[PDB]
């Protein structure tokens, strides 16, 4: 693609410089270029790609929410137009991330933890689309988000222990998806509760540092169960 003429190592190097300079759009464009070289990513590289786009999409989501709020309080077409502009840009970034996950990060991921990591990203980014989608398009997106998360859950249940932070974070986001997006409070609750219990069973076996990592994300599940029940 567009970063096609730059060496893969130079793209990675510049993504780290852009991160240092807090130039997250540049960071994501560099990491897009690296992924489009067609080689698998290391755990560190996957995390660069994830950081970069989460920062970009994060700023767009926060802008969209600000504009949505103003739009709703105003009960002229300008606020809706500019909300639709930010919406379209946010949709483009999500479609870009999803385009990289399906061409071809997911199918090429060489291990369980990376396949879970990308499938969770796939669910999260369909989730960001669902937040601004309407109608039949929203229903399709919801089903695509559900499917990607479910595939991640299947793998993580087969290959990772129940206190593993990746598996815990996946369950946390999927349960949020159920509650906030799919309007499925019962599935949200039961997933968050079973994940919490199954992790708790194994806490006694953990190192001090692992116990901290796991109980941290269990508390995030817990804060949601409190909000929902």
């Amino acid at each position: 693609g567009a970063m096609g003429s730059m060496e893969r190592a130079s793209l990675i190097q510049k993504a780290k410089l852009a991160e240092q300079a807090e130039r997250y759009e540049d960071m994501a464009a560099f990491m897009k270029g690296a992924v489009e070289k067609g080689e698998e990513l290391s755990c560190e590289e996957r995390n660069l790609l994830s950081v970069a786009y989460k920062n970009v999409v994060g700023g767009q989501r926060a802008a969209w929410r600000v504009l949505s709020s103003i739009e709703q309080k105003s009960n002229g077409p300008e606020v809706r137009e500019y909300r639709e502009k930010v919406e379209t840009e946010l949709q483009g970034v999500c479609d870009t991330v999803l385009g990289l996950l399906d061409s071809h990060l997911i199918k090429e991921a060489g291990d369980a933890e990376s396949r879970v990591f990308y499938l969770k990203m796939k669910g999260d980014y369909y989730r960001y689309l669902a937040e601004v989608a309407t109608g039949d398009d929203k229903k399709r997106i919801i089903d695509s988000a559900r499917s990607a998360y479910q595939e991640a859950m299947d793998i993580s249940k087969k290959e990772m222990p129940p206190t593993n932070p990746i598996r815990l974070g996946l369950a946390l986001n999927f349960s949020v998806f159920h509650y906030e997006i799919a309007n499925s409070p019962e599935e949200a609750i039961s997933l968050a509760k079973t994940t919490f219990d199954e992790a708790m069973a194994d806490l006694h076996t953990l190192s001090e540092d692992s116990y901290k990592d796991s109980t941290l994300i269990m508390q995030l599940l817990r804060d949601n169960l409190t909000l929902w029940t």
Binding site: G169, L172, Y179, E180, L220, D223
Partner: peptide, 5 residues
């Protein structure tokens, strides 16, 4: 509801 930070 907050997702993973």
């Amino acid at each position: 509801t907050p997702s993973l930070p």
